[PDB]
Amino acid sequence: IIPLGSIENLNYAQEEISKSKIEGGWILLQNIQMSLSWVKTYLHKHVEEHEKFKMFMTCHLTGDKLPAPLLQRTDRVVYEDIPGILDTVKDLWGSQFFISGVWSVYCTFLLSWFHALITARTRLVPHGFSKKYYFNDCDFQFASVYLENVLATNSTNNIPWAQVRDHIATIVYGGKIDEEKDLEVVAKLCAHVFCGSDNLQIVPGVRIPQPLLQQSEEEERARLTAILSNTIEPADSLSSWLQLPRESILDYERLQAKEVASSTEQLLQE
Amino acid sequence: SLNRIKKFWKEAQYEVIEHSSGLKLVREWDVLEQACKEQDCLDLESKLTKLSEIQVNWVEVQFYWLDLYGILGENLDIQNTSKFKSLTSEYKMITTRAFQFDTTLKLTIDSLKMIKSSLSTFLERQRRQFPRFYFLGNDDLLKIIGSGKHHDQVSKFMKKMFGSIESIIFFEDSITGVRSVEGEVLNLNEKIELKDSIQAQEWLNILDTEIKLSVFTQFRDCLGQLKDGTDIEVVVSKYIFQAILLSAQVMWTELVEKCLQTNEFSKYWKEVDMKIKGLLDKLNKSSDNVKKKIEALLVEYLHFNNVIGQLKNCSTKEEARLLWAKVQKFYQKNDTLDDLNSVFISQSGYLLQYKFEYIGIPERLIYTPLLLVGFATLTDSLHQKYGGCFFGPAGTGKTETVKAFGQNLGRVVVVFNCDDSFDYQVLSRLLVGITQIGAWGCFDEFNRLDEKVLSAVSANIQQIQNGLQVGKSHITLLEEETPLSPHTAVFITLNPGYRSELPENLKKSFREFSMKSPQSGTIAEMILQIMGFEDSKSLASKIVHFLELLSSKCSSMNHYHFGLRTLKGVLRNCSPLVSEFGEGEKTVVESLKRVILPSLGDTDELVFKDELSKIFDSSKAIVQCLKDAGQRSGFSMSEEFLKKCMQFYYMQKTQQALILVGKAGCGKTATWKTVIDAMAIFDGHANVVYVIDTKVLTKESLYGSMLKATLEWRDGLFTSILRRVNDDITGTFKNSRIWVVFDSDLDPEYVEAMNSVLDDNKILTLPNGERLPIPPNFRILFETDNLDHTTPATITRCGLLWFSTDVCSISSKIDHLLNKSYEALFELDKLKDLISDSFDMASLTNIFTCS
Numbered sequence A: 001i002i003p004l005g006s007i008e009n010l011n012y013a014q015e016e017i018s019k020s021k022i023e024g025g026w027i028l029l030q031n032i033q034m035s036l037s038w039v040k041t042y043l044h045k046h047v048e049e050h051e052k053f054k055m056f057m058t059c060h061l062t063g064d065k066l067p068a069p070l071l072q073r074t075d076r077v078v079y080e081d082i083p084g085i086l087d088t089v090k091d092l093w094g095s096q097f098f099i100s101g102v103w104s105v106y107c108t109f110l111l112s113w114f115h116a117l118i119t120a121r122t123r124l125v126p127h128g129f130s131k132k133y134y135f136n137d138c139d140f141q142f143a144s145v146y147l148e149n150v151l152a153t154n155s156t157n158n159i160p161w162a163q164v165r166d167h168i169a170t171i172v173y174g175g176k177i178d179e180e181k182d183l184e185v186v187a188k189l190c191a192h193v194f195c196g197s198d199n200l201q202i203v204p205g206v207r208i209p210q211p212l213l214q215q216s217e218e219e220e221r222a223r224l225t226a227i228l229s230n231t232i233e234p235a236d237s238l239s240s241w242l243q244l245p246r247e248s249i250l251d252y253e254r255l256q257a258k259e260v261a262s263s264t265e266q267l268l269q270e
Numbered sequence B: 001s002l003n004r005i006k007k008f009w010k011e012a013q014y015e016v017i018e019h020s021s022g023l024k025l026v027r028e029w030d031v032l033e034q035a036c037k038e039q040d041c042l043d044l045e046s047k048l049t050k051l052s053e054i055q056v057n058w059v060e061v062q063f064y065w066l067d068l069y070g071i072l073g074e075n076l077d078i079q080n081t082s083k084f085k086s087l088t089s090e091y092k093m094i095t096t097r098a099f100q101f102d103t104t105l106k107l108t109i110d111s112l113k114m115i116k117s118s119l120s121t122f123l124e125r126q127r128r129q130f131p132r133f134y135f136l137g138n139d140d141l142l143k144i145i146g147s148g149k150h151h152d153q154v155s156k157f158m159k160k161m162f163g164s165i166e167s168i169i170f171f172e173d174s175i176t177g178v179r180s181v182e183g184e185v186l187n188l189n190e191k192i193e194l195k196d197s198i199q200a201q202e203w204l205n206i207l208d209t210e211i212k213l214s215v216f217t218q219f220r221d222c223l224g225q226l227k228d229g230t231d232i233e234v235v236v237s238k239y240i241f242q243a244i245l246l247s248a249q250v251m252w253t254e255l256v257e258k259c260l261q262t263n264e265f266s267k268y269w270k271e272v273d274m275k276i277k278g279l280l281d282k283l284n285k286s287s288d289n290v291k292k293k294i295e296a297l298l299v300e301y302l303h304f305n306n307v308i309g310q311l312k313n314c315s316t317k318e319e320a321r322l323l324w325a326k327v328q329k330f331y332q333k334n335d336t337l338d339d340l341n342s343v344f345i346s347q348s349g350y351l352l353q354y355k356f357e358y359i360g361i362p363e364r365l366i367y368t369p370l371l372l373v374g375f376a377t378l379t380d381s382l383h384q385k386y387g388g389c390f391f392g393p394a395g396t397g398k399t400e401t402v403k404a405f406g407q408n409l410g411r412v413v414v415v416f417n418c419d420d421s422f423d424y425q426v427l428s429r430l431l432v433g434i435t436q437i438g439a440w441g442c443f444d445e446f447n448r449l450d451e452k453v454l455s456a457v458s459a460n461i462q463q464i465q466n467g468l469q470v471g472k473s474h475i476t477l478l479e480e481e482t483p484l485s486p487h488t489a490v491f492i493t494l495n496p497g498y499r500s501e502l503p504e505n506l507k508k509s510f511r512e513f514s515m516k517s518p519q520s521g522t523i524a525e526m527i528l529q530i531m532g533f534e535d536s537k538s539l540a541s542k543i544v545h546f547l548e549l550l551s552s553k554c555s556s557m558n559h560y561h562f563g564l565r566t567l568k569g570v571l572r573n574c575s576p577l578v579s580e581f582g583e584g585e586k587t588v589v590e591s592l593k594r595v596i597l598p599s600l601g602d603t604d605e606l607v608f609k610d611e612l613s614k615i616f617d618s619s620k621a622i623v624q625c626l627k628d629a630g631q632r633s634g635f636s637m638s639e640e641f642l643k644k645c646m647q648f649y650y651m652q653k654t655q656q657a658l659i660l661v662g663k664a665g666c667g668k669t670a671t672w673k674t675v676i677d678a679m680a681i682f683d684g685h686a687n688v689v690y691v692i693d694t695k696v697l698t699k700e701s702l703y704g705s706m707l708k709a710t711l712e713w714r715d716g717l718f719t720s721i722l723r724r725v726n727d728d729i730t731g732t733f734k735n736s737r738i739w740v741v742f743d744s745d746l747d748p749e750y751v752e753a754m755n756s757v758l759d760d761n762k763i764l765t766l767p768n769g770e771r772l773p774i775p776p777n778f779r780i781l782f783e784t785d786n787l788d789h790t791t792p793a794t795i796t797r798c799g800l801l802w803f804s805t806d807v808c809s810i811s812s813k814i815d816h817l818l819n820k821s822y823e824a825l826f827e828l829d830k831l832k833d834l835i836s837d838s839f840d841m842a843s844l845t846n847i848f849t850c851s
């Protein structure tokens, strides 16, 4: 793995591809779109014969226009992942490690679930939101740092849930929102998730109890992983895990059918 | 061919075109290079290479010797021993060469390049011993070093060097203070003794260091006075505005915490109500600078009163904590003995340190909740060593919000209001300067950049943010190991889709935000409150609702603008009319009729009048003077023409950049001519009118062109008028009005150079570098036909007047032309009478409508 970017990143990429052209290797240039001018000069000068030389690209469909001749002297593949809310919760849980007691890790756990719910709602363009938003892990990092900084000041039992909820909905997760309805639905989801009641019900299946006043962090992490493994994913996850009506997902699927069938019927004319 | 080439090579000569001794120049380079371009063949190739090197010699020696004969050969403290001997050696050698050698001219290239590198690296010694020098260009900074004993050339360049200081006061060649934008003086804690043998770095460092310690000490003693119970009215006129603001904020924060540990607010609310009422009473009789001071203090105290009143109506303690944590708080450090960071600000549980940089006395943005949310998101981004961002519709308060944040935290944000005119060099220089100083560099309209400059500046800002995040002192930038103070930051503002979003690399390290709708209700309410009106809230709601319905129910014209900038202009223009019309609804109605009415059509005007009668309730000397002036000129006063003349007079009374639009034969030239004549008769000032057509004159003739080969500058007609009116040899322009008109269309290419004039800078931008001011007596006027090819930026920065229909009837035209022809010329009386009775309108209108 080797990201592009600054001049040091470009030199590292050049050295790594030189090493793989000398003796071999498997190289993935992650997010190569961010250095488009350097790509347009360097990759053109490179491609337009050592054995066991493999390297890959990483572009974005909704990004800058790649050079046409570069796309014709390679093999283009695309990949869509599963929208597994459980799977992305597991991935984000394993990406992090944990620091202030057990309230901090409980808040990070709740934040990971909130981020997964928002990212799951992102894909449904006509009902979940009003446009194609692009959330990522940097927003999660800022939210986690804000939560840690709040919990570092007032370590008492009366956690200001309203303040962190408003800061998440307006400033953290509401920065990229331009209109009002998306802000309203993000505020509603913040109220549902960050309530911090006696027993939280993010989905009708599993419930997350709050930590008590004597738990150590290791066995609390064990308990939260155990309540993570006990969850099940029902067949109606795309409408029951995100609080969406059944008629809404029916509308989404009939619009999908309408657009694919209209595309086919336009194909059959010529 | 070979004989001609040999003759041209052996016919080397020069011409005497330079000034004084100078250097004998040579011209017609293309023919010589074409003539220049196997032993004889390689000799000819070497001769062609020598000819190209001679062309390079001539170009570089012109470019160097212009500045050399300007400053280098007549000044010594810029080269202050090694530079002395190098300069005199190159001077004598190249003077001998010009008086009368391929290796000699190659060594001349080497010596000139070494001298250029030496002077540039001397400039970098200036910019490392004092990095505020790095805002300036090479020639300007050379002039700064050369004026080391005059001690008065830094006053005019002081605004460019720092950003908020206009002039320096003096006392027997010892510094006492500096002057702000609005005449406010910044006195020092102690004067500095200006020794005879000093260089700019040392006394400028003690100058800004004493500025920092001076505002520190003034804030300390103002805090002591406020803790002693001293009232604000006596301390407003005593100390500098910055110290007063910091002391007031610190006292308010400490007292509101001491009253927030319990649950009560009525005592401090009544105290601040009495304080603001007394402050307004003191405002109502003070002078101009004191009026601005009390204006800013009353803005901040209105913010304090708003925060306290919001906190009072909280139902629970947690609601109070939520609402208080989101408000920008000011704290103090009474433990650290250092005098640089005893004060810091906090917003939503974060920590940023104050800078002790003077802001002057600027206008303060009205504290609206949207501005507080913007401050919160910027301090959230700056807590994590990231950069803030802004994107949304145009004219929604982004650059002003950034400047407000810079003024609160106490640093002059260097606004890079960029367009197509700027190149890479100035942006890179100002970015590295912002890096080294620790002053925030904001970008305005980042989408306006061209593709390659946008990509490269994106790379530069990405590198500087990466260096900020990892916290390394040295970051590779502009092919140099530029140090980075850990207090610098970068800002950005966008308007996408009009181009693009942020690039992906910048999207990785930035936080987006949108402020599409400014809260105009609270801004208008508090601007009416500071303006002194009896009913601020009702008038503010009425004017905002009226403007909204006007924007909804008018024609979709490109020249219309009813956002927030126009409302701010309305409220900043009310007060001179308030001073004679009093305070009330009538004066704001008259202001609306004075600045928004003339830009409408006819159906738009009837809609405007109907709505003004709906929501709102509703000078003879100038009129009589105008009537007499027109009667002398031979015109006739129709009601529409007299009305439009009246709006034009009342519109030029305040603004100084008026444009006129209308069809052919509408009567705009007559309108401004008779208004100028009335002005000359009434005010007693002489009036002179200059007529320019901006299309038949090219840009190289309107402004002038630099010679790419002759190295000479020609003043254009507009520029020649500016120099001959600025010099004022005859002294007439002191007591006379100047009026230049632009009787042509509006070419965008011909107004991009005018953009400096149409802004409030009142300066001329030129490829040369010399700047001459625009006097308030200078009045630019326009005479156009249509607004199809004009940007919506220029229609807002300057006033617009619309001519809906013909100013006069037909018989007025017959009478005026009859009088003009008679002026060109008992028989006359009867001939005029028979001409008049032959001109029967009863049949004339019939034949005109039948023709």
Ligand SMILES: Nc1ncnc2c1ncn2[C@@H]1O[C@H](COP(=O)(O)OP(=O)(O)OP(=O)(O)O)[C@@H](O)[C@H]1O
Binding pocket: B635, B636, B637, B638, B641, B662, B663, B664, B665, B666, B667, B668, B669, B670, B671, B743, B783, B784, B785, B807, B808, B812, B813, B814, B816, B817
């Ligand atoms: N009160 C009046 N009585 C008679 N003629 C008038 C009167 N006011 C204006 N005019 C006529 O207006 C003419 C000038 O009008 P206008 O301002 O449109 O001229 P212009 O500079 O040529 O305009 P444009 O360039 O837009 O065609 C004069 O020649 C004059 O005959």
Ligand SMILES: Nc1ncnc2c1ncn2[C@@H]1O[C@H](COP(=O)(O)OP(=O)(O)O)[C@@H](O)[C@H]1O
Binding pocket: B364, B365, B366, B367, B368, B371, B393, B394, B395, B396, B397, B398, B399, B400, B444, B445, B493, B518, B523, B564, B565, B568
């Ligand atoms: N307190 C305030 N809040 C919001 N906007 C304000 C405030 N005070 C003044 N303004 C207006 O906001 C405008 C700033 O617009 P700006 O963001 O610079 O637009 P653009 O970015 O398109 O140039 C100013 O012209 C000013 O009239």
